[PDB]
Amino acid sequence: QKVVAGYFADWQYANAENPYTVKDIPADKLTHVIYAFLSMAGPHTGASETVQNLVAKQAEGKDPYTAIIVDTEAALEKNFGAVSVNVPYKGHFAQLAEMKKQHPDLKILPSFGGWTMSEPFHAMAKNKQAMDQFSKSAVELIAQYDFFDGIDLDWEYPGGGGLTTSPWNPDTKLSDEQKASEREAFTYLVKTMRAELDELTNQTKREYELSTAVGVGPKAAGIDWKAAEPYLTNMFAMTYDFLGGWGQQTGHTTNLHATERSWWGMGADVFINQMIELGIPSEKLVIGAAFYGRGWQGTKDFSGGLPTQDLVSEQGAQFGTGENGYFMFWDLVKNYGAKQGYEYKYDEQSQAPYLWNPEKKVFISYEDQRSIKAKANWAKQANLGGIFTWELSGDPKGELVEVMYQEMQK
Numbered sequence: 001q002k003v004v005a006g007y008f009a010d011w012q013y014a015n016a017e018n019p020y021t022v023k024d025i026p027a028d029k030l031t032h033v034i035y036a037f038l039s040m041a042g043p044h045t046g047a048s049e050t051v052q053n054l055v056a057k058q059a060e061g062k063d064p065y066t067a068i069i070v071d072t073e074a075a076l077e078k079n080f081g082a083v084s085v086n087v088p089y090k091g092h093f094a095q096l097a098e099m100k101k102q103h104p105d106l107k108i109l110p111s112f113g114g115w116t117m118s119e120p121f122h123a124m125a126k127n128k129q130a131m132d133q134f135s136k137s138a139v140e141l142i143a144q145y146d147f148f149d150g151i152d153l154d155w156e157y158p159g160g161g162g163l164t165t166s167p168w169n170p171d172t173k174l175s176d177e178q179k180a181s182e183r184e185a186f187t188y189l190v191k192t193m194r195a196e197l198d199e200l201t202n203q204t205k206r207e208y209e210l211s212t213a214v215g216v217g218p219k220a221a222g223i224d225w226k227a228a229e230p231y232l233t234n235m236f237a238m239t240y241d242f243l244g245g246w247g248q249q250t251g252h253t254t255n256l257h258a259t260e261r262s263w264w265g266m267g268a269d270v271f272i273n274q275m276i277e278l279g280i281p282s283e284k285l286v287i288g289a290a291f292y293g294r295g296w297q298g299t300k301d302f303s304g305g306l307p308t309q310d311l312v313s314e315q316g317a318q319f320g321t322g323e324n325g326y327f328m329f330w331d332l333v334k335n336y337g338a339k340q341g342y343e344y345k346y347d348e349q350s351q352a353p354y355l356w357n358p359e360k361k362v363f364i365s366y367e368d369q370r371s372i373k374a375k376a377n378w379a380k381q382a383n384l385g386g387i388f389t390w391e392l393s394g395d396p397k398g399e400l401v402e403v404m405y406q407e408m409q410k
Contacts, residue, residue, distance in 0.1 A: 002408045003286050003386025005032035010074045012393035020393035021080050022095035027103040029405035036111045040134050041066045042120025046164040065130040067138035100147040113154035119164045121155040125185035139196040150209035157215045158182040159222025187227045194231040209233040216271040225279035236286045239268035244294040245316020245325025251307040253365040254290045255350040256374050261308045282383045291394025293327040293366025304356040329394040369403050376407035
């Protein structure tokens with residue numbers, strides 16, 4: 001029985017072009033739904049003003065580093081439709097409670113953190129009591145919202161390399177002291193959360209999962225996997241965002257196979273193998289697939305052949321699906337076809353599709369049925385735990401979910 005997991009972004013329903021809700025989830029084809037994102041009462045100076053305000057409102061009258069719902073409008077308030085379960089809230093959470101009733105073998109996890117809300121973890125990790133407050137309160141939160149089956153951590157990342165912790169800027173770079181501190185803090189955190197969840201099981205007789213997202217390359221080395229892995233159920237390997245419009249280096253964002261034409265030798269396979277070498281058991285690792293793409297404009301010295309290890313562009317694409325340089329799968333399918341000047345290409349060696357617009361010199365790296373099938377078969381061959389996607393709304397018709405399910409469970 002393999003993991004087939006989908007992240008559900010809490011904000012996507014509000015896009016009138018693809019107003020994706022819990023009711024749109026192909027729950028019969030998934031083993032896990034991961035709700036993104038919750039946080040804690042701590043600093044979010046690096047996030048939008050909107051998130052900072054929401055956090056501040058939720059933080060009021062709570063102890064520092066209490067686990068919180070951030071977008072409570074989405075989670076609890078918005079009426080997405082009547083349900084059969086007897087819960088006093090609406091929002092996505094009522095829909096999730098209904099979904100759990102209708103699909104009782106499905107696991108539903110909240111995810112804490114993500115790119116823009118990882119910042120507070122760094123403050124939290126400086127104090128044992130802060131970690132203990134987060135752990136206790138996160139489990140209290142799922143105890144209240146009892147359709148959840150555990151907790152997913154998305155701290156990007158212990159040892160830095162995240163939004164507010166770039167190592168290449170002296171202003172944000174973590175000291176070596178801070179990196180060692182955070183390495184030990186992550187082990188403590190998962191040990192403490194696992195014991196808290198164990199206490200919940202003493203009370204409810206239900207099993208709960210504790211899982212984490214895992215960054216690639218140096219982003220995985222910041223955790224002591226040999227010490228931490230016993231406490232963790234699954235490791236969601238973020239084998240995407242290898243490249244994107246934040247940099248000029250152009251190519252595959254989520255290619256299965258590293259090749260000689262990979263920028264810096266990158267590929268999912270090499271990164272998953274590295275994770276195994278660091279001590280994550282293969283059967284716990286879940287390979288990451290994308291229902292999005294990333295793109296560039298002003299791609300240089302390229303005419304639609306195979307991408308190479310030195311391929312650059314003037315800049316990230318100054319357009320996207322609701323944010324520049326970021327494209328949802330559905331948008332690519334509907335609006336970036338041959339008739340719009342974009343030629344479909346497939347790098348068979350890398351197992352990755354890409355679009356090339358010769359007239360606009362636009363290169364888009366993405367993921368499709370072919371590459372997802374390749375990833376799922378590779379996952380089976382590598383004795384991995386399964387496959388996951390960021391994120392479900394990219395595939396409104398559930399066509400890519402169908403491939404994950406069919407290929408991962410065959």
